[PDB]
RNA sequence: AUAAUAAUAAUAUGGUAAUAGAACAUUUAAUGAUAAUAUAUAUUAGUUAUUAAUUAAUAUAUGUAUUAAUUAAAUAGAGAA
RNA sequence: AAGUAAUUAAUAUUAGUAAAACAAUAAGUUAUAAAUAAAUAGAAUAUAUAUAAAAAAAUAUAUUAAAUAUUU
RNA sequence: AAGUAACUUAAGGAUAAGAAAUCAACAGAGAUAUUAUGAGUAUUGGUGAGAGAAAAUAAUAAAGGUCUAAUAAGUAUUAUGUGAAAAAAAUGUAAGAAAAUAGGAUAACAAAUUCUAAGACUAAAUACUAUUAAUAAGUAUAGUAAGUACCGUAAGGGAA
């Protein structure tokens, strides 16, 4: 009557399982898989136990260490840009810039964002996207390709916080009728980055107070 | 080129009816994805699965030799005895003791299953449905309607109290007495229900959303009304 | 916008068993990006390289046998169709080849 | 179609309905399908064995 | 006008029932007993020099700041300014980096 | 759950398929030996597949 | 260009540990006609390349299958403690 | 009267979707770029390029990417 | 293994916790409780066996804030001995501060942030029992008898 009572699975989807100690014929009798009289036969022996010849983890020198100030930059290639442009999937005279925010909204970039995006050079000789681009920072070949298309790159930075409320605020807003500002560097090394002019960075490029500041505090 | 290309049909036409009798008001056009999808019956057959797998209660819990009750005593000497060698009074050898390997409390048969391939299985079991005839839908108010509804008898899927009476007499006129059918409702349709539990064992009336693939695959007719089709196709949509 | 037009909006050819759709005819559906649903895998340990036509409606061994006419240099015994999900699997990493095929008619 | 239905006593299931385009087709289908049980009645199609012979 | 103030947050309602505008309370410290007294600055009782805890502990203070400033009322509230606690654009603004930022 | 083996990883770390590592022997007891010989001593070496299959089971989410 | 069955030619078909593939019995859940001329179990004699099922006779139940089949699962098979 | 369950990991097969997938409250997981201990470095037949040691820049070693079109 | 078993003491229908001398990072959040993710990541270990956070985002939750201290030294802190495999807060022994112009928080110092110890109350989510209702690919050797017969001096064991 009703189809309920005669469905299956599609070929090649299941197995029978392998049992175990359940006559010789089956193929898996009396030992079940197992041999002779083993450790392995009965009791636990961990799988990459060595014998007690010194095992492959304790023979090597320990190497390197983890950079828990790194933050690893998700990257994104001009070539997929390109791409989404030829697609029509890229709508950007409405917001001027492409931020991460806007890629985000996109697919452009997709997965959660944790640091940031940095924009590298794949597809650049066939790029030509006369677009304001921002992002975490870019490679020189991808700046230069940028330039090349009559577009306009500039490096800023986002704390994870501030990255955060940048990529969608309508929630903050939602949360707290109000958006957190940008925070400022403060570690040197950011601050010596964003300072760059080769970086294309967002300190010397908008020309921010910041490094007017610290030029003062030289001074004096 | 590729000769052959052609372009595929979008909808299909399902007649709006009146639930006392079913009296046919209106064509409604709905789309071929919810209604006229081909038979894969191994994507229902992972739906269905799926859903048996969710609805275990799984309450097998034999004693294990820990749970068992006896002592922890070994009962006979190691050696002296002559007989064979024996531990606590709970081992599996032995006809009082606990269960190799038992399956303890809760037992968990949950399954996972892709939204989107549920979806799809839901709209598969819709489909197979319309070929087969035993969808028939139920409405009024939303569409324009080609005949006039008739008095005494209405479109919201509702009805010794009467109800049952007409209810009776519709199974009577419609040739379904036996058969298992299952009406699938916008909101609780209280009269109905009431209407339809002395038929209890073969009538399933359920609620929009809780509708599952096994309830409409299960049920030899099924009558579900148009805004609840509406809202079950926008919810297994597509895109 | 809405999931039911009014019966006045459709037209008759739209329906089903009014196209000829059946007989010996084919459609590709593009994927949600809009693209061509052909796809390249690697099989049993990324040792075998085989490509893969996905969201096919109608007579896939018609489809079939269109894209052998079309790019012959791909040899006959390597097309191999699956009919429970309708699919055609190639040997080889001919993807590209198989895009082009396609696109100029949908 | 539904005038059809009222006058005949049988009802058709709106897969047919959507695809027979004339009325004569609906006749055709109608012999097929409806005519042969009509006449011998245990020639008629019982759901708990549809592959009945 | 009424309705709106009812539609305000819970907390800072709580807050207007016990210190409400009509006073104007002091900015600096104060006795503990005077009535224009600062819940949010530690004031001192006059037997025995001891100054008192705030009565608003700095954290639930800064919420209900941060409550005012979401609906406009910053000024009804009593000043914060004693209370190193500046919030948002101002403190922003004001704030003078620090030694290791500046050189 | 099931957890990286911490040792292992310290030693090793993962480079697309494979893993990477130290070589041993350069850490004392070098004088003498000649430096263009212990050059091949120094850097990176790639695991044998004999372990590889030891390695992912002790780092099952590197 | 498939499947099922049947041909022709060829090659291959011992097997412990072990690997791989395919079935059957039992019990439970989903779907499910039917009927005391029916069914279930048992004994005997048949039948089908046969751990199984079926036929006939016989005996005992029982107003009658969780029955055929497809899935899902297993306290799923015992001369070896 | 004896290979079971829970929480994970890796491989395979098939199904769904697919340059994205799952989840879609927001997150997050994997994929989308390789490499390096780490760092502000990162892709046009290869003989071009990327990263590492080296360096003015190449070479040299390792791995990677790159061939009227339709991205992996 | 493990602050687990066990022994001992004391309270309640629940207990504990709880309105920051907390987290964070120069932007911010805003009591506890414990579940997803974060994350088997940081941290750590005869660097073996192995152990393993927090911020943050989500759920669950309730009106969740609110004075009952004349705002707190032998206290903070230091030295020394102990002390949740990673993150302290505790504690025996002696030394022993300061008034918001002041304290605590990070090997250390300088900046800067943030909180206010040595006084307190607190529903809800939670644990366990008992009853009722529902659902059982649960049990008739997990289906009511009996803690009986019987065994042991006893604790105790324990049938059909
Ligand atoms: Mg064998
Ligand atoms: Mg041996
Ligand atoms: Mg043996
Ligand atoms: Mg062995
Ligand atoms: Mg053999
Ligand atoms: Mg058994
Ligand atoms: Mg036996
Ligand atoms: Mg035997
Ligand atoms: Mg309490
Ligand atoms: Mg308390
Ligand atoms: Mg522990
Ligand atoms: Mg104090
Ligand atoms: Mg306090
Ligand atoms: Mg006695």
Redesign the pocket.
């Known amino acids: 009557?009703?189809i309920?009572?005669?469905?299956?699975?599609?070929?090649?989807?299941?197995?029978?399982?392998?049992?175990?100690?359940?006559?010789?014929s089956?193929?898996?009798?009396?030992?079940?898989?197992?041999?002779?009289k083993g450790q392995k036969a009965r009791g636990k022996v961990?799988s990459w136990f060595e014998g007690g010849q010194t095992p492959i983890?304790?023979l090597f020198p320990?190497?390197?260490?983890?950079?828990?100030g790194?933050?690893?930059?998700?990257?994104?290639?001009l070539?997929?840009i390109q791409?989404?442009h030829?697609k029509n999937?890229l709508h950007l005279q409405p917001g001027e810039v492409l931020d991460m925010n806007k890629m985000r909204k996109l697919?452009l970039?997709?997965?959660?964002?944790?640091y940031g995006v940095?924009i590298?050079?794949?597809?650049?000789?066939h790029y030509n996207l006369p677009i304001a681009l921002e992002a975490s920072?870019?490679?020189?070949?991808?700046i230069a390709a940028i330039e090349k298309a009559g577009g306009k790159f500039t490096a800023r930075y986002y704390?994870?916080?501030?990255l955060?409320?940048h990529?969608?605020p309508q929630?903050f807003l939602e949360?707290?009728g109000?958006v957190?500002?940008?925070?400022?560097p403060?570690k040197?090394?950011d601050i010596?980055?964003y300072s760059?002019e080769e970086?294309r960075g967002y300190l010397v490029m908008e020309k921010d107070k910041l490094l007017q500041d610290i030029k003062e505090a030289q001074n004096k | 080129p590729l000769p052959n290309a052609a372009i595929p049909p979008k909808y299909a036409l399902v007649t709006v009816r009146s639930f006392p009798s079913l009296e046919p008001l209106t064509f409604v056009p709905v789309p071929t994805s919810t209604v006229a999808a081909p038979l894969?019956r191994?994507?229902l057959?992972?739906a269905?699965?799926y859903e048996?797998?969710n609805?275990?209660?799984?309450?097998?819990?034999?004693?294990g030799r820990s749970e068992?009750?006896?002592?922890r005593?070994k009962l006979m000497p190691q050696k002296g005895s002559g007989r064979?060698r024996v531990g606590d009074?709970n081992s599996?050898?032995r006809?009082?003791g606990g269960?190799?390997?038992a399956?303890?409390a809760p037992?968990?048969?949950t399954?996972?299953?892709?939204?989107?391939?549920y979806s799809?299985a839901f709209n598969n079991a819709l489909s197979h449905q319309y070929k087969s005839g035993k969808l028939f839908v139920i409405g009024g108010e939303k569409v324009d309607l080609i005949s006039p509804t008739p008095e005494l008898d209405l479109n919201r899927l509702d009805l010794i109290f009467e109800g049952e009476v007409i209810f009776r007499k519709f199974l009577e006129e419609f040739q379904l007495k036996?058969?298992?059918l299952l009406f699938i409702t916008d909101k609780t349709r209280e009269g109905l229900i009431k209407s339809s539990d002395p038929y209890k064992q073969k009538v399933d009336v359920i609620q929009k959303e809780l509708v599952e693939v096994?309830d409409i695959l299960?049920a030899?007719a099924v009558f579900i009304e148009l805004e609840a089709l509406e809202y079950l196709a926008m919810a297994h949509q597509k895109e | 916008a809405p999931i039911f037009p009014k019966l006045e909006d459709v037209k008759m050819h739209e329906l089903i068993g009014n196209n000829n759709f059946g007989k010996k005819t084919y459609y590709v559906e593009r994927?949600?990006?809009?693209?061509?649903?052909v796809?390249?895998?690697?099989?049993?340990?990324?040792n075998?390289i085989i490509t893969?036509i996905?969201?096919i409606e109608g007579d896939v061994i018609q489809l079939?046998?269109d894209l052998?006419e079309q790019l012959p240099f791909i040899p006959?015994?390597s097309?191999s169709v699956?009919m429970?999900?309708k699919?055609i699997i190639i040997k080889g990493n001919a993807?590209?080849a198989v895009?082009?095929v396609?696109?100029?008619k949908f | 179609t539904k005038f059809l239905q009222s006058k005949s006593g049988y009802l058709i299931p709106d897969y047919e309905l959507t695809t027979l385009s004339t009325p004569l087709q609906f006749k055709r289908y109608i012999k097929e399908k409806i005519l042969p049980s009509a006449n011998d009645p245990k020639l008629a199609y019982?759901e708990?064995?549809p592959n009945a012979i | 006008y009424k309705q709106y103030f009812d539609s305000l947050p819970?907390?800072l309602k709580?807050?207007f029932q016990?210190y409400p505008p009509s006073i104007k309370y002091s900015p600096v410290?104060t006795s503990?007993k005077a009535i224009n007294a600062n819940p949010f600055?530690?004031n001192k009782?006059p037997?025995?020099?001891?100054?008192?805890?705030?009565?608003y502990?700095?954290?639930?203070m800064?919420?209900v700041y941060?409550l005012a400033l979401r609906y406009g009322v910053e000024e009804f509230l009593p000043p914060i300014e004693n209370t190193?606690?500046?919030?948002?654009?101002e403190?922003?603004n004001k704030?003078?980096l620090?030694?290791?930022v500046l050189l | 759950?099931?957890?990286?083996?911490?040792?292992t990883?310290?030693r090793w770390?993962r480079?697309?398929n494979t893993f990477?590592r130290g070589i041993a022997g350069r850490k004392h007891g070098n004088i003498g030996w000649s430096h263009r010989s212990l050059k091949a001593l120094t850097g990176?070496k790639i695991a044998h597949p004999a372990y590889s299959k030891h390695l992912?089971r002790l780092?099952?989410?590197h």
Do not use: C
């Open positions: 009557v009703s309920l009572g005669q469905l299956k699975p599609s070929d090649g989807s299941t197995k029978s399982f392998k049992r175990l100690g359940r006559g010789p089956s193929g898996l009798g009396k030992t079940s898989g197992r041999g002779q961990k983890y304790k320990k190497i390197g260490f983890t950079n828990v790194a933050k690893p930059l998700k990257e994104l290639n070539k997929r791409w989404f030829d999937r697919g970039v997709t997965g959660p964002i944790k940095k590298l050079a794949s597809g650049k000789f920072r870019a490679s020189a070949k991808a704390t994870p916080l501030g955060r409320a990529l969608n929630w949360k707290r109000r957190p500002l940008q925070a400022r403060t040197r090394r010596d980055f760059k970086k | 894969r191994d994507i057959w992972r269905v699965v048996n797998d609805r275990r209660v799984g309450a097998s819990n034999p004693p068992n009750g006896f002592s005593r064979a009074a599996p050898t006809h009082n269960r190799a390997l399956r303890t037992n968990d048969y399954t996972e299953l892709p939204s989107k391939v799809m036996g058969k298992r096994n299960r030899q | 994927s949600r990006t809009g693209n061509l649903p796809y390249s895998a690697y099989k049993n340990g990324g075998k893969e996905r969201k079939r046998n052998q006959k015994k097309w699956v429970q999900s699919k993807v590209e895009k082009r396609l696109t100029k | 019982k708990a064995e | 819970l907390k709580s807050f016990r410290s503990t600055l530690p009782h037997v025995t020099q001891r100054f008192h805890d705030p009565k502990s700095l954290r639930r800064s919420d941060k190193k606690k500046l919030f948002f654009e403190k922003y704030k003078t620090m030694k290791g | 759950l099931m957890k990286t083996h911490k040792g990883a310290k770390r480079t697309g990477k990176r992912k780092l099952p989410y």
